[PDB]
Write a protein that binds this DNA or RNA. Structure first.
Ligand SMILES: [Zn+2]
Ligand SMILES: [Zn+2]
Lengths: 530, 530
DNA sequence: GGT
DNA sequence: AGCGTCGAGATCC
DNA sequence: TGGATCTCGACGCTCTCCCT
DNA sequence: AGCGTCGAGATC
DNA sequence: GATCTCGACGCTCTCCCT
C-alpha cells in the first residue's frame, strides 16, 4: 500500500518504457499513480487500481502490452465501451479487436486463427464474461496460446462487479476464478472508479488471488469552481437567467445541462431554441438515430449545449467542456460528484453551478419510495445546499472519508470567496406554531401537503385551516421555505406517503423528535448572515 | 425459547381447537406448529425454519380463519400458488390469486372484493412485482387497511431477500415498503434453508424489530440409509434394480434419480423391456409430455419415475416407499433434499445409494466453473468411503446440529453391521504411483485415471510401465478405493484440459506428497478384519 | 379511474 | 388525487 | 349607494432516472 | 481428444 | 495352441430458472 516506494526509473525495462511513451503515444511525462502501477506489473505482480473516470487508467495496461511479445487479454462488460477504445487505438496504428455475442462465422474463425498463429501482429483482444463461461472452443484456444508463451498478461475492467455489494451486480463475473487456476503464470490487473474496502477484499477471493497491491488516487479536482444558487419561482425568469450566461461569459464555449425528467428535458430545449441558442435533447425514450446524431454534432462543435437526463453519461471523454449546470438537484451526493466531474478534463479552469428549489425535494422523494435508503441519501444532498459557510471541498471529503487539510481550496468555491460574518438565530417558537396547525388539521380529519401548510402559516389559503392567534413573520417566501426544510431533516417534522391511481404523493406530519419540546427550556437555532 | 409458548390458556385457544378438527379434519399438532400459531395470535413477528413437508403452510392458513377478512401472501412462482388453491378449494374455503397473465375482467373483480364490505374472501396470493410496480394494486391495499379488512401478512421463500440467499430474486429488495405503510399488521417469514447470516440480513431489509426465531430438526426417524457398490457391467446393474422392484418393493411406488438426460432415457427403456411400468422426466420434453407423466404416477397407473434433478418441486405424494440413486449427488445438501421425498406419511421407507469410481470424474468436469464445486463434491465422496460411523452422525456434522449418538436405533446400514476393524498401512503404494507419474512427465505424456490403474496392474501400453513395481493381489474395486483416498487427502490432484467438445480430468502429483521425504511418515486406511 |  | 383560473357574492375603508 | 379586496364553488388539465 | 473393437503379425 | 502388442477405423461428447 505504498506507491512512492515504486517511483524511480532504474529497472531494466525503464528504457523501452520511456521510449514507448514519447514515441508511440506522444506524451511527455506521467500523471499521478501511472508510473508506480506500470512498474509493479512489469515486476510480475498482482495489483488493484482505484481512480476516477478520465484519470488515466487504461494506459496502465495498454502500454506494457507493447513491451513483451504477443497479446494481452481484456475483459469488459459492455459492447459500446469496447468500441470506444479500438477507435483510439486504430488512430495510433495499433492492431487489436473484439469478439462478441454478435459476430460472424468468418470473423469468429479469423480470431481463432490469429491466436495460434505465431507470426500475428495482434496486441489486444477484448471479450465479454459469458465468453469465458460458455465457450469450450474459445477456452481451448487460450490453452494453446498460453503453452507457446504468446500470452502472459490479463486485465479485468469494472472489477467491483465480482462482489455482491458493488451495486451493479453481473452474475457472469463469479466464474472468473478460472483464470488464475488455469494460467497461474500470467499476471493480473483490476480496474475501477468505485469501491468500498470490504468490496475489494472480497473480489480478491473470488478471483482466487494472493497476495495483492492496492493503490488509491484522490477525489480532488483543483481546476473546478463550485457554486449553489437560489432557483427562481417563475419558469420564464429562470430561462432568461441561463441565456445571460450562455451569450455572456460562456459565449462560444461547450457545456451540458442536467434535468430531472424526460419532459423537463424537452421543454427546456424548445425554449432555448426559440431564442436562437443552438441546443439539442438527450434521453432514453428517443430513437437510437436521434441519440447518435445529437452526440455527433456536439463533438464537432456544431452544437453548443446538450440538455439531458442521467441517460447521457456512460463513456463521455470530450476534453474542453467549460460549464456544467444543474436545473434540479441530484438524488444523492455520489451522483452529483460524477455528473459535475465531466467538466474540465483538459485541466484548465471550469465551472459547476447548481440551482436549489423547495419543490424539488418532494418530487425526488416520491420517485425513490421503493429504494430502502432512498430518503436517507436525498437528505444528505439537501444538507449541502442549506450550508452558507463551510468550504465545498470540506463537505465532500466528509462523504468519502478522505483526510482533508483545511486550507487547500485556494479560493475556488463560493463559500470560500464570501466576505460576510454570521450568527445563530433562535427559531423555537416557529416550530411550536406549525405543530398547532398540524394538530388542528387532524381533529378536522384533513391532510396537508407542503403547499397548504405554508399557506395557512402566512394567513392565506382555505379559511377553516387557519389557527387563531398565530402570526406569520415578515420574511420573504424563500426564507420560510428554508426554515421548514430545517425542521424536516432534523426530524421535528416528517413525510407521510399516499398511493393513488396515477401518483405517489407526500404529506407533512408531526415527527419523532417533537417530544423534545416538552422541556420548556429546549432551544432550536439556525445559522444566518449578519 | 418455544418451550414457554406450548400451552392452551389464551383467549383464542377455543376457536383454534375448534377450527383444526372441524375445518381441516385433524387430531393434534405436529412439532412447532402450536408454538408458532400462538405467537402470531399474540400479534408478534416470527421466522420459521423447517424442512419441506413439515407442516409450514398451516401456520398462516389457520389464523386467517380466526379473525375477519383476508391475509396477504407473497410467493415467487406461479406453479407453487396453484398447488395450494387446489387444496383450499377441496376444503370449502374461498381464495384466489393475481398474476402477470390475468384477464381484465378478473383483475376488476379482485380490486372489487378487497374493498367490498361483506366479501367471503379469505386469502390472496400475489407475486413480488405486484407490490413493486402496480400503482392501482397498492392504492387498493391502502383502503382495505383503513377499513380493517386486512391485518396479517405472510412471506414465502423469505431467504430470497438476501444476496447470500443462493436463490436471489431482485424484486424482493422492495418489500421493506410493507411494514412502513402498514405498521399495525403482523408479519411471518417461511423457509427450509437458512444460515444465521442470511436471516439477520432479511430482518433488516424487511425493516423489522424485534423478532422470534424457531428452528425444527433435520431428523427423519422412519427412513433407512444404505450405500452399495455399483457393478462394472451395465447389463448386471439393471438386474439388481429389478430384483428389488419385483422382490421386496412389488406393488409399491418409488423414484430413481440419474446424472444426465441421456441416462434417464436408457434406464427407462431397459426396465420396460422386462415388464416394469416406468416413465422418463427431464427439462427437455414438451410441457404436455411432462404433465401427462406426473399425472399417471399420482394415480398409480405408473410404478416408477426415472428422473434428473428437474423432477422435485411441487411433489407431495404421501406414500413413496423407495428412492434409489443411480449415480451419486453433487453435494451433501442435494442428497438430503432428494432422498427426503420418501416416507412423507411417517411410515417406514428406504433410501439406497450406488457408488462408482468413474462418477467422481464425470461430476468434477461438469462443475468446473463453480468456485466451490470441487470442494462440495469431495465431501460427498468422504461419506461413501466410510464403513463404520452412523449415517445420522455424519450428516449432523454438516448441518452443525447437536446430535446424541445412540438415537439412530438400528436404522442405517453401518449401525446393523456385525464386524470389527483395523488400520492397514498403505505408504509404499503411494511411493509406487508417484514413480509412474514421474516417468510419464519425462516422456511428455499425460495420464487419465483409467491409464494409471492400467500401468499399476501391469497392463496397458507398454512404454508407460515401470520396472520393479508389482501390482498387488487384490480386486480392482479395492485399488479404486485406495486411489480415491490419496486424492481427497491431497497426495494426488486433478488437472483439467479444454477441448473442442469436452472438459477432461488428468491426474498429477499433489502437495501433501513432499512429506514422503521423512522416513518416519505413514499413511493408513480403515478395513474389515478377516 | 384517485370518497 | 392536487392545483390554477374564472366569476359571483360578501366583506372591508 | 363607490371602489377595492376576500372567499369559495365549479370546472378543466395533469400525473416521475438509469440496463443493473 | 478418449476408449473400444478387430485382425495381422511376433513371441508364449 | 493360446496368450501379447500394435495401427487403423469408428463412435461419442454432461443439472435445474436463478
Ligand atoms: Zn472552498
Ligand atoms: Zn445409524
Amino acid at each position: 500500500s505504498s506507491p512512492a516506494a515504486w517511483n524511480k526509473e532504474d529497472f531494466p525495462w525503464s528504457g523501452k518504457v520511456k521510449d514507448i511513451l514519447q514515441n508511440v503515444f506522444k506524451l511527455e511525462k506521467f500523471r499521478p499513480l501511472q508510473l508506480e502501477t506500470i512498474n509493479v506489473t512489469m515486476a510480475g505482480k498482482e495489483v488493484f487500481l482505484v481512480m476516477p473516470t478520465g484519470g488515466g487508467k487504461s494506459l496502465c495496461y495498454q502500454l506494457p502490452a507493447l513491451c513483451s511479445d504477443g497479446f494481452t487479454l481484456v475483459i469488459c462488460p459492455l459492447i459500446s465501451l469496447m468500441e470506444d477504445q479500438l477507435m483510439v487505438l486504430k488512430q495510433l496504428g495499433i492492431s487489436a479487436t473484439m469478439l462478441n455475442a454478435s459476430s460472424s462465422k468468418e470473423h469468429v474463425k479469423w480470431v481463432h486463427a490469429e491466436m495460434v498463429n505465431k507470426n500475428s501482429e495482434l496486441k489486444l483482444i477484448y471479450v465479454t464474461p459469458e465468453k469465458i463461461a460458455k465457450s469450450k472452443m474459445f477456452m481451448s484456444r487460450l490453452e494453446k496460446a498460453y503453452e507457446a508463451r504468446r500470452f502472459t498478461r490479463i486485465a479485468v475492467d469494472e472489477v467491483h462487479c465480482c462482489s455482491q455489494w458493488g451495486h451493479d451486480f453481473r452474475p457472469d463475473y463469479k466464474a472468473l476464478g478460472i483464470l488464475k487456476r488455469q494460467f497461474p503464470n500470467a499476471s493480473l490487473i483490476g480496474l475501477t472508479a468505485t469501491a468500498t474496502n470490504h468490496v475489494l477484499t472480497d473480489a480478491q477471493k473470488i478471483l482466487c488471488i494472493e497476495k495483492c497491491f492496492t493503490f488509491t488516487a484522490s477525489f480532488n479536482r483543483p481546476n473546478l469552481y463550485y457554486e449553489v444558487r437560489q432557483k427562481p419561482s417563475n419558469t420564464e425568469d429562470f430561462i432568461e437567467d441561463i441565456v445571460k450566461l450562455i451569450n455572456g461569459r460562456y459565449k462560444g464555449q461547450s457545456g451540458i445541462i442536467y434535468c430531472f425528467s424526460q419532459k423537463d428535458s424537452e421543454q427546456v430545449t424548445v425554449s432555448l431554441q426559440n431564442l436562437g441558442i443552438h441546443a439539442g435533447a438527450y434521453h432514453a425514450n428517443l430513437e437510437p438515430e436521434d441519440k447518435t446524431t445529437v452526440h455527433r454534432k456536439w463533438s464537432a462543435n456544431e452544437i453548443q449545449v446538450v440538455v439531458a437526463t442521467v441517460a447521457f453519461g456512460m463513456g463521455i471523454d470530450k476534453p474542453d467542456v467549460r460549464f456544467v449546470i444543474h436545473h434540479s438537484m441530484s438524488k444523492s451526493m455520489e451522483n452529483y460528484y460524477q455528473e459535475s466531474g465531466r467538466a474540465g478534463r483538459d485541466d484548465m479552469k471550469a465551472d459547476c453551478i447548481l440551482y436549489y428549489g423547495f419543490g424539488d425535494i418532494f418530487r425526488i422523494s416520491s420517485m425513490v419510495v421503493m429504494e430502502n435508503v432512498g430518503q436517507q441519501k436525498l437528505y444528505e444532498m439537501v444538507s449541502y445546499c442549506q450550508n452558507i459557510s463551510k468550504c465545498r471541498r470540506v463537505l465532500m471529503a466528509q462523504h468519502f472519508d478522505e483526510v482533508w487539510n483545511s486550507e487547500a481550496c485556494n479560493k475556488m468555491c463560493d463559500n470560500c470567496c464570501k466576505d460576510s460574518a454570521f450568527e445563530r438565530k433562535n427559531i423555537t417558537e416557529y416550530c411550536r406554531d406549525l405543530i398547532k396547525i398540524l394538530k388542528q388539521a387532524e381533529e378536522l380529519n384533513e391532510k396537508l401537503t407542503p403547499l397548504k401548510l405554508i399557506d395557512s402559516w402566512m394567513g392565506k389559503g382555505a379559511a377553516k385551516l387557519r389557527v387563531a392567534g398565530v402570526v406569520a413573520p415578515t420574511l420573504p417566501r424563500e426564507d420560510l421555505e428554508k426554515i421548514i426544510a430545517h425542521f424536516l431533516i432534523q426530524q421535528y417534522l416528517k413525510e407521510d406517503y399516499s398511493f393513488t391511481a396515477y401518483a405517489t404523493i407526500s404529506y407533512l406530519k408531526i415527527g419523532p423528535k417533537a417530544n423534545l419540546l416538552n422541556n420548556e427550556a429546549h432551544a432550536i437555532t439556525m445559522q444566518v448572515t449578519k
